[PDB]
């Protein structure tokens, strides 16, 4: 495998150290949350619809 899979791993290591290096804990924490409450809307809607059908 070596001649290709090690190329993969080393280029991937460069890119993923770049990515992790370009990460401020505070701002990216601040953006950690906004995303979490996205599938929470669909949950509300589906609960509502099951309710309405049963009603």
């Amino acid at each position: 495998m070596g001649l290709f899979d090690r190329i993969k791993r080393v280029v991937s290591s460069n890119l993923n150290d770049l990515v992790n290096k370009a990460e401020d804990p505070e701002k990216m924490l601040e953006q950690a949350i906004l995303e979490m409450q996205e599938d929470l809307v669909q949950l509300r809607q589906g609960v509502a619809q099951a309710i309405a059908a049963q009603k």
């Binding site: 804990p25 995303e35 979490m36």
Partner: protein, 54 residues
């Protein structure tokens, strides 16, 4: 979403412990515990003295 959440959990805990390492690294960690050991009964001794002062 929780993947970022928990990798960030580890992020913050690592930050706290790494910063706190500087304490024991420097030479004042055995002095603070000296003071705490020598004063642990002092607070109770002070309370007892205050009660006896009644």
């Amino acid at each position: 979403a929780m993947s970022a959440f928990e990798r960030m959990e580890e992020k913050v805990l690592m930050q706290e412990s790494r910063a706190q390492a500087l304490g024991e690294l420097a030479g004042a960690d055995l002095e603070t515990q000296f003071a705490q050991l020598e004063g642990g009964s002092d607070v109770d001794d002070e309370l007892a003295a205050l009660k006896a002062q009644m």
